[PDB]
Design a protein around this motif. Structure first.
Motif, short mmCIF file in Angstrom:
data_model
loop_
_atom_site.label_atom_id
_atom_site.label_comp_id
_atom_site.label_asym_id
_atom_site.label_seq_id
_atom_site.Cartn_x
_atom_site.Cartn_y
_atom_site.Cartn_z
N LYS A 58 46.25 19.01 40.95
CA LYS A 58 47.54 19.57 41.34
C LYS A 58 48.48 19.65 40.15
O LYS A 58 49.43 20.43 40.16
CB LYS A 58 48.18 18.67 42.43
N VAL A 59 48.25 18.81 39.13
CA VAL A 59 49.06 18.77 37.91
C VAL A 59 48.18 18.43 36.72
O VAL A 59 47.22 17.66 36.84
CB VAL A 59 50.14 17.67 37.99
N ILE A 60 48.51 19.02 35.57
CA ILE A 60 47.80 18.74 34.32
C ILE A 60 48.81 18.25 33.31
O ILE A 60 49.88 18.87 33.14
CB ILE A 60 47.10 19.98 33.73
N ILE A 61 48.49 17.11 32.69
CA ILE A 61 49.30 16.52 31.64
C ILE A 61 48.47 16.76 30.40
O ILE A 61 47.33 16.34 30.35
CB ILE A 61 49.52 15.00 31.83
N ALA A 62 49.04 17.43 29.41
CA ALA A 62 48.33 17.71 28.17
C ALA A 62 49.13 17.20 26.97
O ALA A 62 50.33 17.55 26.84
CB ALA A 62 48.09 19.20 28.04
N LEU A 80 48.83 25.89 37.91
CA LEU A 80 49.19 24.54 38.27
C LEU A 80 50.29 24.15 37.29
O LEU A 80 50.32 24.66 36.15
CB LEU A 80 48.04 23.56 38.07
N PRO A 81 51.20 23.25 37.70
CA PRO A 81 52.17 22.85 36.72
C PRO A 81 51.45 22.15 35.59
O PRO A 81 50.51 21.39 35.84
CB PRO A 81 53.05 21.84 37.47
N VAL A 82 51.88 22.43 34.35
CA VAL A 82 51.34 21.80 33.16
C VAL A 82 52.46 21.09 32.40
O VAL A 82 53.45 21.70 32.04
CB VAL A 82 50.66 22.83 32.24
N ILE A 83 52.26 19.80 32.14
CA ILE A 83 53.22 18.97 31.47
C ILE A 83 52.75 18.74 30.04
O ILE A 83 51.63 18.25 29.83
CB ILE A 83 53.36 17.61 32.19
N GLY A 84 53.61 19.05 29.07
CA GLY A 84 53.26 18.91 27.66
C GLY A 84 53.91 17.72 27.00
O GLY A 84 55.11 17.59 27.03
N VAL A 85 53.09 16.85 26.43
CA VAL A 85 53.58 15.68 25.72
C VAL A 85 53.43 15.95 24.21
O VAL A 85 52.33 16.10 23.73
CB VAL A 85 52.77 14.41 26.10
N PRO A 86 54.55 16.04 23.48
CA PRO A 86 54.46 16.21 22.03
C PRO A 86 54.14 14.89 21.32
O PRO A 86 54.90 13.92 21.40
CB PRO A 86 55.85 16.69 21.63
N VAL A 87 53.00 14.85 20.66
CA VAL A 87 52.55 13.67 19.96
C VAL A 87 53.28 13.65 18.62
O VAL A 87 53.55 14.70 18.02
CB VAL A 87 51.01 13.69 19.76
N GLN A 88 53.63 12.45 18.17
CA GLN A 88 54.33 12.30 16.91
C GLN A 88 53.36 12.58 15.76
O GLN A 88 52.43 11.83 15.53
CB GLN A 88 54.94 10.90 16.79
#
Lengths: 156, 156, 160, 160, 156, 156, 156, 156
Positions: A58-62, A80-88
């Motif tokens: 239902k959701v993707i965290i990338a 699907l909603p996609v959540i983006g996490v910016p890595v340092q």
């Protein structure tokens, strides 16, 4: 079984992405975690994005750093909603990561969170909130969790 | 009636926020639009965030520029997903807007989208994608919309 | 009793905010220090801001990092002067902190100081200067303090 | 007579600094406005800073752009609260102005506000708040002003 | 005696400013080094700038970090060339130092060099180059110094 | 026929990308120009990248702005040299474009050029330089072109 | 013998530039490595650039930091493709390096890669891709190398 | 005859560089102005730098934008003081210009001034100050000029 997919371009990103997974474990939300590289396994990334809905996610965290294209390319292949996490990133401390992810053009949104570990934590919570919009039990858990931290900060 | 709440701190932000509202109209998702200022109507902002869930809202789209606190303070007062649209500020071209919104600490996520009109557009699409995770009809409409644009760009 | 309120979002910010408090101690200005989080205790933050004037506070010093909304949201809820200290964030080194604090819109000022410890020190001095505009004794103390540092720097001017 | 001094390095900065002065006029706070250049009239700047307290000033609002040293150098020469307004520069859009003003070292605070006109407005409000910490009438006026805007924004909340 | 004045706001800046002084020593140019703080000893700074010419100085090298006003305020009070060395600040890594120094308005130039130790080194060389425009012996020494480094890098 | 492929995500990018095409025309290098969007036509992009070598292309010039993923995703799908032109975006003036293109991770290079039109011009020249490494006639033309400009600037 | 030339302004840059050389070794592409400083050995740099083509070189990889002029000045003196590696500088973490290399004006392209080691790796690969446009054996090796990494990441 | 050389990479930079020349005219300092491109006329730039001292120049003012290498490359070829004026570039508003010029490594200083027209004005004044260190008449003129502007600002 899995409602959320947590993916990243390299095993070295796991240090950051595990925070998201902790939140999902804490809230008892089933999820899967995999390495999916936009640049090293592009076809595999398209297959993962295409099939996500059919497989029950239902959701993707990338998570991705530098020229971070994983969240946006996954977003272009699934609704699907996609959540983006910016890595340092090493040199630009995630500034590159952030701009590559958040500046998506009209038509292909990516729900972007803070750079680093705080963002990873929040990705898991945001995924939960998304599910919580229709799973009353998950929403109630988020409220209780937030009420406990509030009491803890104010009285601590 | 309304599933999504679209708010902003000033009438001048409407120029940017209408794009999100056009998308919701285009996808037949009922919504409300209001001026809610984190800095000029702080109490009202709290009251709007507190009651969102009771009132039936599933997602909140909040736009703000400069020291953009609206999305974040609303997110701290509701466990509905909150989508933050960074408005393009005059001096720093939305860089201040972007950092003030996206860098939220662990516990209070804000789904951040691109600076400006592309982001506003995407905020509406992201809200639809969230609803589409449980409303198949809304999801099917997003797929058809994306397929039509694809065909249009490739054949154009 | 307390004339100044020093607040911050987390205990980890204390490393930075104690510099402001050392200044207030040095100048004998009574103050209170508390953890008030814009995002983790939003209601408590409003309550703290609303009541500040009634409780006798004259200035508020608020420290926060990243998407630093504490100073601005406190400033939207009280007409006491609010001083914002941008805490050095891990990734963007306080650049996010700075912009989130200083760029407040017309109607809700926040007196913004330098990123980090230098800003914390100056928040305490700025609060003192504010009080010093009407308390001559506090003002005189600031002048004397500044005259001693001047002498100290200038007479230790030879690099040897 | 004057409680606040509003200064700037060039006449071209007036476009920005008049917003602070509109606030002081609106609140009936007597003030003076002058061109004082840190780089073109350095001696005059020191003289203006040194004498501020003797002349009766309680706060100084100083606007400057680029390598903006006026607020900081004025702050090094008086213990009155000094409010710095970063003027939007042509090339770096006030980023140079901002850093040159806000990043003051321990010992010499400058209350820094937003880049441009919003900051100018807030400088006038911040000066008023400073005076308002001891002048109840000025404080009450700030509360009323803020209550009217709140009502104005909230009752014009429907986008139509 | 002294032709160049090397000043800085704090003893902690010596770590950076000594490089300039090593160059002057290496080229046998007499100089003085002092702590002169724009913000902690403002009057003294004015007195140091005012009298520089009368005292025989031909160039001033000034180092400062953060809101670096020392080079600029000294430059406004003397028509001797003033060389500004941006010290690497803790939070913004000398970006604040750089902009505060180099962006001087029309009428008051400051010869700005690189952030940090490379700049300090170059400040000493630049001061020598200035003196070398009228002191042939100093110019000849700069040429020989540069020729030796050239040979060293190319053959090394 | 075509040795170079010039692609971009939107027709609005044409204003910038035609500079590259003017160079290829000037140097009589056959090329093709197409709109290929990483986010709006992702599948088509993969197909275009995959088949490039089989179709006889030797270099690909790709222009994109904002969260510019086109050059990088094309590069992950072909081992032809890929040249990335950062288009000047509205809010961040191509800084987002630049970082999204240049910061590619180990394994997937993208030859990045300047933001905007100057970069587009250089993309065409760089493509020619690549062909010129094995086509002596193309190399001689670049030398003659450069010599004429040199004579023009120095004597003009 | 040598088809590629790997150069840098200082021996301290070797830590970064050896990544490019490792790739060329891995792919068995003959190359030469030298210290060539734009600022400390300017004449030598011109001579190196001028003679590159006559000496049989096909591509030049140049690494530099800070006010990084080596790649650009080399590029102005040869019509061989020149690849610029921005070395991570101390104060500005390669941002100065990046902007000094990538922003070349119309007429003198420099193929710019990522800041640091990742960029160095990609510089070697890009040089190989350039040779691979006319050397089918080098191209086949790049495909096989990329396929092995793909299998490794997806199955690992 | 000429004591100062004012050079620039393109005629389009004349809009910025003429301010420096106005100051030199105002102060009656003989100078020459020429277009010298680091990238389009590199050899000509080396010849201009090499011969500057022999021809009688005491200071060189060089203007350049983007990847601004003109001031630094001229500085590497002459031990005359070289003043760098960062021209306001289109996309990055001279940020690129500034970093390319001011971040020179140890050994090759460039006296850097503000971005744009204010910097150009100051370059002329700085050149004057440099000459004024040995020409008492030029120094006295700078004092009088500065005293007139002071009276004008304070009394105006």
């Amino acid at each position: 079984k899995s409602l959320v997919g947590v993916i990243m371009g390299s095993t070295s990103d796991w240090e950051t992405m595990k925070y998201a997974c902790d939140i999902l474990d804490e809230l008892n939300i089933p999820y899967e975690k995999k390495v999916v590289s936009a640049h090293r396994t592009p076809d595999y990334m398209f297959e993962y994005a295409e099939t996500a809905r059919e497989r029950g996610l239902k959701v993707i965290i990338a998570g991705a750093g530098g020229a971070a294209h994983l969240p946006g390319m996954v977003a272009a292949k699934t609704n699907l909603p996609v959540i983006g996490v910016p890595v340092q990133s090493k040199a630009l401390n995630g500034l590159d990561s952030l701009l590559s992810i958040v500046q998506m053009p009209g038509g292909v949104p990516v729900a972007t969170v803070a750079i680093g570990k705080a963002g990873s934590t929040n990705a898991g919570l945001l995924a939960a909130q998304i599910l919580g919009s229709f799973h009353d039990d998950i929403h109630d858990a988020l409220e209780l969790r937030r009420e406990a931290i509030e009491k803890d900060v104010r009285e601590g």
